[PDB]
Amino acid sequence: IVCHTTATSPISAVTCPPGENLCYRKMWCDAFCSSRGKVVELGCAATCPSKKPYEEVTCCSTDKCNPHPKQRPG
């Protein structure tokens, strides 16, 4: 299983088996919470971390299962 990283610089699914047993999709808000919503910063992790204030972290363990609404197809 591989995870993508929107919080590094570009975005790419790299295998994260050393430590992170899976992936994680995070969301929150950028410089100014635009009307478009938050962002989509997923990546790798050992377990869906952060879950007390408002951080909406998520998880995903599958062939690049961190695809967010990026290239709106159609």
Partner: peptide
């Protein structure tokens, strides 16, 4: 310039 929840082309505006 974000992989927001509705775009993937570093859109400025």
């Amino acid at each position: 310039m974000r992989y927001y929840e509705s775009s993937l082309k570093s859109y400025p505006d």
